[PDB]
Structure 1
Amino acid sequence: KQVSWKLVTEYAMETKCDDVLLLLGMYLEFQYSFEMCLKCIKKEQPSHYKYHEKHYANAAIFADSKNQKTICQQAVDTVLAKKRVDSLQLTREQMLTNRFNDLLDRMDIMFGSTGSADIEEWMAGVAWLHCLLPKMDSVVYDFLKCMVYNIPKKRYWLFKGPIDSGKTTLAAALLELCGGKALNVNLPLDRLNFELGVAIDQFLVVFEDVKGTGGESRDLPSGQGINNLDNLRDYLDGSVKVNLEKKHLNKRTQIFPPGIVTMNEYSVPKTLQARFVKQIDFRPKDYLKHCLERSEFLLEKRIIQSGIALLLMLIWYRPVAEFAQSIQSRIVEWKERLDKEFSLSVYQKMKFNVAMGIGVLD
């Protein structure tokens, strides 16, 4: 009997593999007899134990096949095809709702019986993040609205401030919450062309720690990053479709995604400042630093960087009526869960602990 190419494509669609080698490796694991397999007995990785029993019959025939990478490439092309359909056909609020469901699925595994995560530690991350900027929940919601509305010159936010002020921390958390890519535009213009091609069909880009000039009076070393962004100001506007490029593929024409620019206090040209709708001035705080070294699980488990921490913040602080109709059902359930496991008094003591620089759980 022949290998079903349909079942490989179905597995790739269910797990959302863009990576042809990862799909090959995953599916080859399904060779071995389901009745005994240690990974399913451990329930180690969910993209295995949920799928092995279904795919075992096909994976045994797949292992005999002489064209295995051709099968996996078609399956990856089917996942890339659906992603390009979704980008052109979904409303941008549907795209965010789809990302929130994927994060809520990940939360259901993390905080259940199987998962390692302790919501007490993750909500301590919510408390630490809510102390970073004034009215942080409103900041997050206003960012989401901006990324959803995609208003044709009002699409980018600027994060500015010293070393260890929290810019990359909040940017990486918003990058996981919305989904997107990080781009390093400090590299020279002849390689920059392929860096920008990583934005093809993405929801956000974050331009991380871009360097200007005129910094040596502050011992900030100069670089080309801000001169590179001002050559790309066509891409930051998003009024017209730009032509993105990746190796061997012909150019794709699209509106370049919304995003965040993070920098130290270099000077920004007025032409580029015109592209940024809002600037957030991050300031280092002594108590946030003292709190983190007494609360090291926040850094080790990467809680303060995680989109799941900002999503928990939105669940805790925002009204139900702000979420899209599809997720409001799951959101109401998560609000009940947080009010069951924390009183307001535990959370208010967590924020008091942060302001004192004491360990968040103390």
Structure 2
Amino acid sequence: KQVSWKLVTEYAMETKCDDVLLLLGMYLEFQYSFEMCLKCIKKEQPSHYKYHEKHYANAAIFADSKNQKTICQQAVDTVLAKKRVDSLQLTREQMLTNRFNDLLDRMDIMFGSTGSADIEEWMAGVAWLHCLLPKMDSVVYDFLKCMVYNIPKKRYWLFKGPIDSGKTTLAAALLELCGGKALNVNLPLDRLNFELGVAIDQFLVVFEDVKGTGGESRDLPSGQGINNLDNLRDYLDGSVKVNLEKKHLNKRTQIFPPGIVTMNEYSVPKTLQARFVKQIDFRPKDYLKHCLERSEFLLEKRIIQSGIALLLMLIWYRPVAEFAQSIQSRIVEWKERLDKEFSLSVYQKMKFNVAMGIGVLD
């Protein structure tokens, strides 16, 4: 009779779906009676089995509409219209809490009744990560406060180290823990601005492997990335706003996002150095490598690079009140979960096993 465009927009806003084709393809699965849906019975996809029921009726009418895409276009624009509002209205801590909430939804399913994730292998990831840097759980908390506070000339951390030292991994988990885009400044001074535009609306940015000049004697390729950063002081310390680009034309004007610079031991100009409020030197450690050699699951399952392993470390080490009021109920809920499955002496042993480089789970 008359397809309800509203319900479709609701489903989209509930699934957080900003892809028109992906929305179309999912709403259409609902057109079949749920009174038999195996996707639901078998709980295949949460984005499906939690809405099929409610939307059967409307999806059945939807499958007969003459402009299903136009409808999905408005549902999507709605998700984007909201993503644009929060962009200007939400505070940074709220930005961070939403990210956090989205990661918990991911964790709720991973370690749930209908999920594959093995939490024991993920706490092993926490043990390995907490052995990568001293007072690692305090570091992540600090980093998070640095990013949310986002204060001029104190918004960037510099990860320096050889390859396979750990900065890339920690810098990756940190990225996913907060949401944000990595960028590449090892480009020609004219190709730069396009890349810099990527950081639009982002919470944080990670300048992956910035290459410098000097050090070719130590087998390190000369690049202009370091040189470009020293020319992007305005961006890094962000005291005033900046104009960002995309679509071959100027878009947003804002405070460049705070972040991390991953580097490979190139000499740094004193003017560049001064832009980093914190520096972390990573050196490859033998036991850590050996631990992995005897714990393939941490790599093959991409656990130690996952921002989830870091959120997990927080929930496990950090005091509840350190989180936002709004999300604390969900945090205590996970602490109890965790505390109920792992004792301290068990988690501690995992850390001991890493130190001995033998296999977290031995």
TM-score using structure 2 length: 0.94
What is the deviation of 1:38? 2.9
Contact 1:182 1:206 in 2 (8 A): yes
Match of 1:36 in 2: 36
Q: Distance in 2 between matches of 1:67 and 1:241?
A: 42
Contact 1:155 1:236 in 2 (8 A): yes
Residue segments in structure 2 that go unaligned for 5+ positions in a row: none
Match of 2:359 in 1: 359
Distance 1:74 1:198, change over 3 A: farther
What is the deviation of 1:122? 0.6
Contact 1:287 1:354 in 2 (8 A): yes
Q: In the TM superposition, what whole-angstrom CA distance separates every residue of 1:227-257 from its partner, at most 9, and x where no partner exists?
A: 2223332221222221222216651112121
Distance 1:196 1:53, change over 3 A: farther
Q: In the TM superposition, what whole-angstrom CA distance separates every residue of 1:107-151 from its partner, at most 9, and x where no partner exists?
A: 222222222112211100000000001110110010000011000
Distance 1:18 1:223, change over 3 A: farther
Q: Distance in 2 between matches of 1:26 and 1:256?
A: 36
What is the deviation of 1:347? 0.9
Deviates more, 1:156-165 or 1:189-198: 189-198
Distance 1:192 1:52, change over 3 A: farther
Contact 1:197 1:245 in 2 (8 A): yes
Distance 1:179 1:352, change over 3 A: same
Contact 1:147 1:258 in 2 (8 A): yes
What is the deviation of 1:291? 0.6
Q: Distance in 2 between matches of 1:36 and 1:187?
A: 55
Q: In the TM superposition, what whole-angstrom CA distance separates every residue of 1:145-171 from its partner, at most 9, and x where no partner exists?
A: 001100012111111000101111001
Contact 1:122 1:309 in 2 (8 A): yes
Q: Distance in 2 between matches of 1:41 and 1:19?
A: 26
Distance 1:249 1:66, change over 3 A: farther
Deviates more, 1:310-319 or 1:158-167: 310-319
Match of 2:210 in 1: 210
Distance 1:199 1:12, change over 3 A: farther
SS of corresponding position for 1:231: coil
Q: Distance in 2 between matches of 1:56 and 1:272?
A: 58
What is the deviation of 1:97? 1.7
Q: In the TM superposition, what whole-angstrom CA distance separates every residue of 1:4-25 from its partner, at most 9, and x where no partner exists?
A: 2222221221111232332232
What is the deviation of 1:332? 1.9
Contact 2:24 2:68 in 1 (8 A): yes
Distance 1:341 1:28, change over 3 A: same
What is the deviation of 1:335? 1.8
Q: What's the C-alpha RMSD, in Å, of the aligned pairs?
A: 1.8
Q: Distance in 1 between matches of 2:142 and 2:112?
A: 31
Contact 1:83 1:201 in 2 (8 A): no
Distance 1:222 1:18, change over 3 A: farther
Distance 1:192 1:70, change over 3 A: farther
Contact 2:239 2:255 in 1 (8 A): yes
Q: In the TM superposition, what whole-angstrom CA distance separates every residue of 1:170-192 from its partner, at most 9, and x where no partner exists?
A: 01111111111121222334443
Contact 1:181 1:202 in 2 (8 A): yes
What is the deviation of 1:321? 2.4
Aligned residue pairs: how many?
A: 362
Deviates more, 1:28-37 or 1:107-116: 28-37
In proportion to residue count, which structure has more helix? 1
Q: Identity rate of aligned residues, in percent?
A: 100
SS of corresponding position for 2:132: coil
Distance 1:188 1:80, change over 3 A: farther
Query: Where does 1:1-362 land on structure 2 (aligned, <5 Å)?
Result: 1-247=1-247, 250-362=250-362
What is the deviation of 1:277? 0.6
Distance 1:139 1:61, change over 3 A: same
Deviates more, 1:166-175 or 1:81-90: 81-90
Contact 1:174 1:310 in 2 (8 A): yes
SS of corresponding position for 1:217: coil
Contact 2:243 2:250 in 1 (8 A): no
TM-score using structure 1 length: 0.94
Deviates more, 1:165-174 or 1:180-189: 180-189
Contact 1:12 1:23 in 2 (8 A): yes
Q: In the TM superposition, what whole-angstrom CA distance separates every residue of 1:321-356 from its partner, at most 9, and x where no partner exists?
A: 211222222222222222211111111110111011
